[PDB]
């Protein structure tokens, strides 16, 4: 024979919007939710016995209901509520994992004035989270951002690297740096101001990336920029225990025009989709 | 036997970023361009004669070159320069059409302070344009916006429609209205303040959709909203001669939970991707 | 001040699958349909009067309904039925347009035996159609194929073209030719064997592109290959009156490796997404 | 303060096509590659020291060069060569992980003869792999298939499930089953006939999904179909050690037409993108 390494089932792509009407003032949150369950029994896989299966339509129905019953403050707490539900409202469930994405609605805003009930879509950075809980254990939550495409046109360089027989790249004291940042962090407590924690992380990444809006900040290696950002998050948000960052390097190359008799000294650039540099890192607090 | 009704060829997906730097204060524009040429001879089609063909690679080189030589003030004027170039540098080109999309870079901004050289991607709406010119004739420019996703949670209704065998819909005094607006307008002259124009059209659409940030504005049929915005655009911008608008109705339905013994008082909603209402309209000035 | 040039509304992305079970042998057709209606009255746009509006939900319901009632033999005939219905079941509808996309289900098959009820998704090319009819007029049908990606590794060249100030490209005796074909043709009668005609066009396109299967056939100009195919379709199918073809030129370049001291003698190629050649043409029968 | 958990960097989306010409017979492989390296030194993150950095542009060139130098027989073998190189041509590299996706070119074929140099795109299923190697250690290869959309119109059901407060679903003896299979397996030796292994796994999955092309095989639970496929994969291919399979449930629901006074007798269906059932599992050989 064989041996199970891992099982799970659930409903994916459960889209939902929750509204809270105050005055004429509406609060809105829309997300796409994915829930996975692990069972104590594997008779479902072994012999096709369905008697312990919560039907995927039902888990769909449950997410909708919990939205009504518990309400939705943040994507994280909702995830935690879904988790706790499947672990306490049932007995044969050993593990539940919720991954949800938030739909980036932004309240319409004419300088300081905010519309009571109109919103526009602004994918600046995309918010997501995950909450995973084992039966009778304290839950684990990750939060993160993705697709934050930022661009700086100077105060970046790359020099003094290893040259080998396959190397053709020449040194550069100045070059574009364009990325689409992805970040994912684990919390040390279930007790966090999630909305606020999130904002802080985001603001940190953009900040160490851009530096002072005046003179900028020179960055000599995206590795070092990446590490410096990690450390800054860990100081500002004590409840973050671990942080992972992915920074693609989406290239803009100066178009050489000598073969057509023009001298293009860094006016016109060719944005190149593929391929792309990729720079990663995951750091945690010394236990 | 047969007859040509229409020919064209060129290069598509020509990406470019043009930068203009004042020391540490940098200005940028990035776009994706498509250009098409029509030739006087069809010997290329009839007999495979390449004697009159301007290679697509040359069209690419040219878009690159003109970006350096002419600079890029707007995606529209860039579009007009490409049209003019191929009609005057050659004798046998009868028509040229350039369709271009702007990559929506936004200068980074915190609390009134704006970064000298850093950008974020937050597409309220995506900008695009077209310029089409025949030999020795005056060129025609269209400009437009797309993928502007907006949501209204109230101040919309839909009642008093026709019932037939297939109608199941009941009257509604109040409901969500969500759309992803697309608009395209033909200018009556090449003499336009393009940046201010495009923004003016956008702001008009958002303002008429949302209404006052105080109370909103009721709309009984999206057709009328569509029509009203058209008229409003024709008042606000004299150089616009014709305007087309497509408004999807991307649906948000109140989830019935009675089958699970809960009463959902318009709190939790189901976003439904497909299908979607589609309401279009095209209006021009009466000569 | 103003004047309508064009109006229309409807429901889009209406997905539907129809099944016809004879023995244990199931026949299936799945499509995504979008229908647009034009009304005699414009009081809906002008004054928010909905009394002539056939609700888009009803348009949705009707497409589901006609499917049961008329059944679905082809997307073209279904499109024609939708047309006929809205024109004959109402009097205030002046125009209806149905554009349909077909989901490329292919019956599962191992060694000549065909599963009675299992299917796999292998979109060699994607099929679509359009039907447009004016009140009490004879309808017009278009059919076409899209996203048919094919590649040749030889028997193509591009020499004897124009050099101008911006040309850098040299003669090429041999090169890859890769495209993603789009074709769209109008029938001169509603009386067509649609499944057979469509297949005929497709086979013509690939055959004139690729064959004979041994040594292939040299083509000196993509313009000419496109054209010869237009003539071959017009010879094989008397009911096609007009045909349009678009062929992107998706580039594969031999990677120059001399700068790293290797000689790449046309072994390793760079597939490049952007930019792309584009070659178009529309010819019709000499009336 | 802190301590590293995981570092890595490289080039992503490296596209490559390798051609091998015999007679008139051309062989082709087109793939897209991702390479990640881990270094012994962390001076790069700590202080922005680049003296140990192999530039991503170099990794791109290395990949290109290796395609020419070593050739490309399978995407797995190419992956292993890239691993091998960076670990042996250098000293400071502690780990390399390469991920490759294959572009599904299929040789064009009519009436028993196969074209010598023409291909068409039929992603029946999409192939991919991963090779990860630590310095001086034995490398690990995973391979997989994805986006295999298969559909059956009968021989599936779902009954005898667990009921709770949020359940509305009723027993169902017969229903459509549409999935888009994803499977990924680890080999216990890097010494494998990859092309055949791949193919066997693929055919096994479509095999067990459809049952006999005559009567099908009744299936009561995708968990069992899932598990059943996993064991047949492990018995037919001794070199796969662990197997992961994910199967979405892309729903096709019978359209109730009674509210418009029709009986839709399991003829017409609504395909639903969202939400989707999801059933996963990972089983391995017991050590």
Author numbering:
A (entry chain A), B (entry chain C), C (entry chain D), D (entry chain B): 8 to 294
Task: List passages from the publication reporting this PDB structure.
Urate oxidase (uricase, Uox) catalyses hydroxylation of urate to give 5-hydroxyisourate (HIU). This is the first and rate-limiting step of uricolysis, a three-step enzymatic pathway present in both prokaryotes and eukaryotes that converts urate into the more soluble (S)-allantoin. The oldest known structure of the enzyme is a tetramer of the tunnelling (T) fold domain able to catalyse urate oxidation without the help of cofactors. The zebrafish (Danio rerio) urate oxidase (chr11: 8151055.8158017) encodes a protein of 298 aa with a C-terminal tripetide (ARM) corresponding to the type 1 peroxisome-targeting signal.
